[PDB]
Each structure stands twice: as structure tokens, then as C-alpha cells.
């Protein structure tokens, strides 16, 4: 066009659009810091999983 | 009467017993879970 647009303003809606579905799935802190956080909340869910297998199936009582 | 309460004697110690097992299984439950949080 100049060899004799709206691309700032783009750029930004769509970093805002991503930090907002970001911050919704959960990308709004330091990836490693959220991936251990991410991990050790699974592995809590799993212990809490398997000491509730091991309460309910091999019952004391009868 | 001394066999009558020996009898009732057995049986309450065994549902003591049992319900001391229960409490000490939910007591573990509760640590584990606390410990897990």
C-alpha cells in the first residue's frame, strides 16, 4: 500500500481472549509451580482413593 | 443370676470391642485424611 491496519489492537484482544481462557483452565501462575501443584493434588486423590479401597473392602466387621 | 450376667458381661464386652474397633478404624480414616490435606 506505502510502496510510493487494526494489527496492534488484534494482537492485543487476542492475548486478552487468551489469558482469559488461561486463567479459566488454569494457566494463570508459573507453569512448573501449577504442574506440581497439578500432580500432587492427583496424587492426593489417589492415596484418598486407595485408603478408602482399603477401609471398605476388607471389612473388620461382619 | 451369676451365669445371666456373666452371659450379658461376654456380650457387652464383645460390642465394646467392636465398637473400639470402629473407632480406632475411623480415627486412622481421619488421620489419613487430614494428612492428605
Given at each position: 500500500?506505502?510502496?510510493?491496519?487494526?494489527?496492534?489492537?488484534?494482537?492485543?484482544?487476542?492475548?486478552?481472549?487468551?489469558?482469559?481462557?488461561?486463567?479459566?483452565?488454569?494457566?494463570?501462575?508459573?507453569?512448573?509451580?501449577?504442574?506440581?501443584?497439578?500432580?500432587?493434588?492427583?496424587?492426593?486423590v489417589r492415596?484418598?482413593?486407595?485408603?478408602?479401597?482399603?477401609?471398605?473392602?476388607?471389612?473388620?466387621?461382619? | 443370676?451369676?451365669?445371666?450376667?456373666?452371659?450379658?458381661?461376654?456380650?457387652?464386652?464383645?460390642?465394646?470391642?467392636?465398637?473400639?474397633?470402629?473407632?480406632?478404624?475411623?480415627?486412622?480414616?481421619?488421620?489419613?485424611?487430614?494428612?492428605?490435606?
Amino acid at each position: 500500500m506505502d510502496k510510493d491496519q487494526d494489527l496492534n489492537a488484534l494482537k492485543t484482544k487476542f492475548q486478552e481472549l487468551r489469558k482469559l481462557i488461561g486463567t479459566m483452565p488454569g494457566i494463570h501462575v508459573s507453569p512448573e509451580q501449577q504442574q506440581q501443584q497439578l500432580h500432587s493434588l492427583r496424587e492426593q486423590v489417589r492415596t484418598k482413593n486407595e485408603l478408602l479401597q482399603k477401609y471398605k473392602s476388607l471389612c473388620m466387621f461382619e | 443370676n451369676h451365669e445371666a450376667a456373666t452371659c450379658l458381661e461376654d456380650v457387652v464386652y464383645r460390642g465394646d470391642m467392636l465398637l473400639e474397633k470402629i473407632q480406632s478404624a475411623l480415627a486412622d480414616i481421619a488421620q489419613s485424611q487430614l494428612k492428605t490435606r
